[PDB]
């Protein structure tokens, strides 16, 4: 949050970058710094006695301009401190234990006592119960409960099964159980967590082109105001005595867009902080803004419908087999399928049709996995001879044991093939019990996620490429308005370059290495933490929550940053009319007494109005530090309505809030009797 | 009287619209490099003789062409004005002009400024104002229309690297827009009473006995192309207020329509070249709202007028001081604000002899940049300078990459846009500061108090803004004034033309995005109000310190 009162003293120590070496990088406030030093030495000589006057006015102006600089650097340093706190929260302990390396890759091999900071590519390491992953990589065999709360915020014990859709691991996370091996993929210091910590600690923050263009407009505006307030001196010298240098410098610093000039770094440092707080590791603010400008979104069904391979069961159709006999077959299958995916099929069948006639205790079923030569179940302890295999597997079983197969199983396989799902057949005894329907279900709330995407006007294209009918069904109960059946990598590259060549911007959220070239060719690249390592370096940003629709949050924050900076610079520009109405009649009351009818605020004195303006200039910055931290509230509106809302809030805040601020500060000064 | 002003503004705008909309269909034809109906054979037998190659050239060669043509024009005009005694058509045998006045007049006439620091009928021969002044009155407008044609071609071309050919551009624009409409306007002025005779200065004995002397010459021929475009340098010292230039109210209406004809037709051509007339009517509304508001405040200020006249025993208090007789208070006020809105520089009423509130507004519409139909050719690109910033701010409020008419806008033209916007107030404020840190400039004062500083600010704004309209109290015949205004004129023309051409070259390469569902429509009342707010915000935030010590100070006196 804003002020935890933990590191505020440290960041206030870090405010002191007042030396010119660390200040010329922001010219719109280097002008403020030079003006502050100039009015400070004017105040010093003024109190010494080179020129006659009170010198308390000049001393107060010099102090308050230094105060404006100090709160600008305070905003920047507080944003940097929040970024450092986020980086230290994501730090964990990278080097926490010696690595259990093996000279030869095999479970139960020669152990090692090597430290966890020199492991190279292709290094195998054993992980036992109650351990922690040293460095990122992939598993080879085995797997158990792995918790990633200390890295990603997810305390769910996500398993790491060998191969398959997810087999990659990240270093620095707790391991709860035994039977984990890890093959190293990248060296320490090549991972994205360490890269994010390095770029936060380095704090270079190469500015986005939008940031550079906004800085260019701020520079143009401060050149304009500098020349106006500099040429104001001969015009005043023409009529009577000229306006003093202190008043000119204070008016200049008031006119300079000081608020956005101070919060320009914070808008973007808080952007990186909100990247890291949304479980996303982002490389560049240009990538963040391009992700905020996504119009076309791309996905695959391998990460949407129960993350693939865990499709549900639908009534198990069969010819000549009654529903109760099919339920008995489901029970006999529930007394089998010792694989994890097989047990998933078992529990889906049980929740489809619960049956409690016999269990694992009454029927002592042999718990054996499949055989690699035929994908066959080794269970034979029941009354019927049980086989769990595919079509070719069960044909080989027929000419291995039963002899000749009928055409009923062939036509049932044909019906299943034309209806979709998977052609895996459950067989007990010498008769088939029907091909199990294994149509998938769209897990989660991806329907309303796609509804939110369509409300935000982002195209959602779903690219897996199985067949046109099941892609149409997946679109129907998913929410994507189109898809791409019969998908190949060259077709993906052609489609993405056609979208990029039609005048639209795209984004990919792939996981595998096959679509990694297309994902890297995309100008916005979202990498999957559960996805492959090579695709993770091929990406631009990676989301650590294993959520395909994290891009909606990425669009939210990326648009929030641009909206915040544009709104703040418009507010800073719009305050200048009120700053004129406060300063100019007071600034020229000495030599143009006829101008004393312009201060419609009915301010007290010329020596008080300028102080009130500079105090308002400092206090608006320190009050808008929370607006720099937390961005402008995004609502899913159209362009015209959102521009109208931004105008009605912030442009109306300009020319009205400075009225109240200057009047209240002048009233407080008169009450305190300082002026 | 307020109702008379209301109908005056209304019918002037209706006649301007119905005369400018058909010119858009025909200026977009010139933009598209499509010959007008009935001149293809004349074009193909003309350009072969002239050596104008049909091949197109990029922004660098286009800009080099325009600047070389302007340098040649400046050299020819300078060496003609330094002579004019070795040259014919000098019936009164006028002497050769001084070097400083010749340089200032030459740069004023070539850089679309037309600022007269002299008396024309007693300083210039017939030949200068017939040939050398008139060719610059033609080619400055032609160069401005060529620059905006390059910008419009850059906006409408998808991914080409060329902006067309400048030589054929100015040739076609001049010979088929600027010449024949000038013939029509000139013959109308001969019909109504403006003279063009080439006769020697004919002395007249009046009915009383005081032998005066009348001036003659090619007055209406220069008048027609001085009104077409936005040139605004007259034959005499009282430019477009002498009865020999605009004798009556119908002539003055033709003056007004010729002032606003080319920028309004250019806006219509910009609307019709994209296939979306909303994109042009957006700019037309954004200009016209500011225009009519400023007309209203000027007429109200001049109707309030001089308060001392009622206390000095007069039947009314309208500021007839320094205003014509057959042109009313409202009519001369409208011509003042039209002149200083469209960068013309021809004044009916002497702008120096205005009420403070009615004299601040011409200064304001000059100093904000020539955006409200401002300048021939300049009236669109000076407004595009503010459009490319308003759409940037609007895209920042949306939270997307800022794009105008599909093409993305980035740093590589944000630098040029910022430079081209700030080059104008830099010149205005630096010149107004230099004119008061020297004895000269501060010593050419005619009126004391804040009105003198208002005079100096108006003069330097007119020099830097290519207007030419004058608070004529300032005696700018001094070499310091001539050199300062010459430098301001030169930089205020070619520090705006160059970055506009660079923006065009950077923009023509970028492929235009076709359409999207979520981009901000830059045609509606919201965008019109945003552009108007930008124009009234920056351009006033610059000069409120400058305007407070002059007209505001003497108004609150």
């Amino acid at each position: 949050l804003f002020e935890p009162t933990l590191v505020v003293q440290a960041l206030k120590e870090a405010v002191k970058k007042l030396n010119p070496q660390a200040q010329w990088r922001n010219p719109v406030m280097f002008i403020v710094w030079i003006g502050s030093l100039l009015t400070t030495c004017i105040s010093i000589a003024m109190a010494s006695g080179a020129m006659p006057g009170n010198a308390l006015f000049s001393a107060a102006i010099s102090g308050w301009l230094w105060i404006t600089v100090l709160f600008a650097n305070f905003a920047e340093a507080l944003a940097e401190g929040r970024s450092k706190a986020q980086a230290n929260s994501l730090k964990g302990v990278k080097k926490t234990a010696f690595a259990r390396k093996l000279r030869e890759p095999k479970y139960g091999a020669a152990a090692d006592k090597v430290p966890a900071d020199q492991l190279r590519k292709g290094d195998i390491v054993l992980v036992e119960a109650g351990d922690i992953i040293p460095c990122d990589g992939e598993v080879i065999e085995g797997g158990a409960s792995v918790d990633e709360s200390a890295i990603t915020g997810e305390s769910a014990p996500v398993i790491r099964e060998s191969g398959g859709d997810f087999a990659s691991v990240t270093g620095g996370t707790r391991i709860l159980s035994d039977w984990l091996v890890i093959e190293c993929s990248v060296n320490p210091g090549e991972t994205f967590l360490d890269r994010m910590i390095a770029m936060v600690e380095g704090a270079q923050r190469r500015k986005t082109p939008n940031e550079i263009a906004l800085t260019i407009l701020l520079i143009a505006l401060t050149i304009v105001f500098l020349l106006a307030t500099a040429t104001l001196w001969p015009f005043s010298a023409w009529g009577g005595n000229a306006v003093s240098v202190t008043v000119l410098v204070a008016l200049l610093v008031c006119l300079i867009p000081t608020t956005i000039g101070g919060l320009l770094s914070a808008i973007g440092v808080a952007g990186m902080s909100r990247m890291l707080g949304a479980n996303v590791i982002a490389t560049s603010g240009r990538a963040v803004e391009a992700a905020g400008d996504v119009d076309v979104l791309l996905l695959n069904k391998t990460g949407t419908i129960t993350l693939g391979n865990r499709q549900a069961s639908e009534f198990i159709p069969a010819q000549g087999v009654d529903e109760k006999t099919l339920a008995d077959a489901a029970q006999l299958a529930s007394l089998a399928d010792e694989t994890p995916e097989g047990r998933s099929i078992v529990i889906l069948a049980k929740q489809r049709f619960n049956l409690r006639e016999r269990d694992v205790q009454s029927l002592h079923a042999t718990f054996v996995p499949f055989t690699a030569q035929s994908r066959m179940s080794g269970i034979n302890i029941d009354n019927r001879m049980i086989r769990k295999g595919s079509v070719d597997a069960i044909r080989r079983h027929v000419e291995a044991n039963g002899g000749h197969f009928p055409t009923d199983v062939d036509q049932k396989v044909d019906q299943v093939a034309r209806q979709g799902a998977t052609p895996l057949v459950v067989v007990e005894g010498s008769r088939v019990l029907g091909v199990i329907a294994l149509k998938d279900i769209v897990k989660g709330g991806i329907k309303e996620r796609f509804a939110q995407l369509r409300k935000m006007g982002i195209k959602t294209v779903m690219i897996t490429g199985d067949n046109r009918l099941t892609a149409a069904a997946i679109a129907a109960e998913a929410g994507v308005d189109d898809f791409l059946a019969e998908a190949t990598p060259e077709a993906k590259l052609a489609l993405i370059r056609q979208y990029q060549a039609e005048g639209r911007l795209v984004a990919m959220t792939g996981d595998g290495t096959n679509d990694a070239p297309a994902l890297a060719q995309a100008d916005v690249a979202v990498a999957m933490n559960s996805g492959t390592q090579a695709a993770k370096e091929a990406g631009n940003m990676v989301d650590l929550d294993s959520n395909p629709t994290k891009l909606i949050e990425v669009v939210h924050i990326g648009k929030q940053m641009l909206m915040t900076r544009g709104s703040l610079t418009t507010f800073s520009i719009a305050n200048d009319v009120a700053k004129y109405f406060a300063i100019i009649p007071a600034a020229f009351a000495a030599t143009y007494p006829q101008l004393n009818a312009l201060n419609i605020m009915c301010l007290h004195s010329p020596d008080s109005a300028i102080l009130s303006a500079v105090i308002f200039n400092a206090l608006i910055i320190v009050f808008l530090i929370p607006l720099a931290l937390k961005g402008v509230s995004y609502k899913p509106l159209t362009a015209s309505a959102m521009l109208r809302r931004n105008l009605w809030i912030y442009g109306l805040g300009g020319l009205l809030v400075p009225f109240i601020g200057i009047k209240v500060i002048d009233l407080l000064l008169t009450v305190c009797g300082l002026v | 009287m307020a109702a008379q002003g209301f109908l005056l503004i209304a019918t002037f705008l209706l006649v301007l619209m119905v005369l400018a909309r058909p010119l858009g269909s025909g200026l977009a034809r010139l933009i598209n490099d499509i010959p007008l109906p009935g001149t293809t054979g004349v074009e193909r037998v003309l350009f072969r003789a002239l050596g104008v190659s049909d091949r197109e050239m990029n922004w660098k060669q286009y800009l080099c062409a325009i600047l070389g043509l302007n340098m040649l024009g400046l050299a020819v005009l300078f060496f003609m004005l330094l002579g004019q005694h070795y040259l014919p058509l000098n019936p009164q045998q006028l002497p050769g002009l001084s070097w400083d006045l010749a340089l200032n007049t030459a740069v004023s006439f070539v850089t679309n400024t037309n600022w007269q620091s002299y008396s024309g009928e007693t300083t210039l021969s017939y030949f200068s104002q017939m040939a050398g002044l008139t060719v610059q009155n033609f080619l400055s407008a032609a160069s401005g229309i060529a620059v905006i044609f390059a910008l419009i071609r850059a906006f409408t071309r998808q991914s080409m690297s060329t902006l067309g050919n400048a030589w054929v551009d100015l040739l076609r624009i001049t010979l088929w827009v600027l010449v024949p409409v000038a013939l029509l306007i000139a013959l109308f002025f001969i019909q109504q009473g403006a003279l063009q005779n080439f006769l020697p200065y004919q002395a007249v004995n009046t009915v009383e006995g005081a032998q005066q002397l009348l001036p003659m010459g090619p007055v209406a021929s220069q008048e027609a192309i001085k009104m077409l475009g936005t040139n605004g340098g007259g034959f005499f010292n009282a430019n477009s207020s002498h009865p020999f230039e605009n004798p009556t109210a119908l002539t003055n209406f033709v003056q007004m329509l010729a002032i606003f004809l080319i920028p309004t037709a250019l806006c219509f051509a910009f609307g019709e070249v994209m296939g979306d007339r909303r994109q042009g009517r957006m700019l037309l509304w954004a200009m016209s709202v500011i225009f009519v508001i400023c007309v209203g405040v000027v007429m109200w200020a001049e109707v309030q007028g001089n308060p001392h006249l009622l206390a000095l025993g007069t039947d009314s208090s309208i500021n007839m001081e320094g205003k014509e007789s057959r042109f009313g208070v409202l009519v001369s006020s409208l011509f003042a604000v039209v002149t200083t809105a469209a960068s013309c520089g021809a004044v009916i009423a002497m702008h120096d002899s205005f009420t403070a509130l009615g004299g601040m507004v011409p200064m304001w519409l000059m100093q904000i940049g020539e955006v409200v139909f401002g300048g021939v050719g300049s009236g669109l690109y000076g407004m595009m300078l503010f459009v490319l910033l308003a759409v940037f701010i609007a895209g920042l409020m949306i939270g997307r990459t800022p794009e105008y008419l599909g093409k993305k806008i980035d740093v590589r033209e944000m630098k040029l846009t910022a430079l081209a916007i700030l080059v104008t107030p830099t010149l205005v404020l630096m010149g107004a500061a230099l004119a008061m840190m020297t004895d000269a400039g501060r010593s050419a004062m005619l009126n004391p108090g804040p009105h003198g500083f208002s005079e100096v600010l108006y003069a330097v704004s007119s020099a830097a803004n290519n207007n030419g309209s004058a608070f004529a109290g300032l005696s700018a015949n001094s070499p310091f004034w001539n050199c300062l205004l010459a430098f301001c004129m030169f930089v205020g023309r070619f520090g705006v033309i160059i970055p506009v051409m660079a923006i065009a070259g950077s923009l023509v390469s970028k492929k235009s995005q076709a359409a999207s569902s979520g981009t901000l429509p830059t045609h509606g009342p919201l965008f019109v109000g945003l552009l108007i707010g930008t124009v009234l915000l920056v351009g006033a935030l610059t000069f409120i310190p400058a305007l407070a010590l002059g007209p505001v100070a003497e108004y609150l006196s």
């Binding site: 990088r25 010219p27 280097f30 002008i31 030079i34 100039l38 550079i212 260019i216 520079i219 143009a220 401060t222 050149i223 500098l226 020349l227 500099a230 001196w233 240098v245 | 740093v411 630098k415 910022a418 430079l419 840190m437």
Partner: peptide, 27 residues
């Protein structure tokens, strides 16, 4: 004109040069 304002003019020109340099630069 006199002394004491030439340093102000020089410092204003120096600030303008630095600001134009920052405008052209993409630092």
């Amino acid at each position: 004109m006199s002394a004491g304002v030439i340093t102000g003019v020089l410092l204003v020109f120096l600030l303008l040069g630095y600001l134009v340099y920052a405008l052209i630069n993409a630092e």
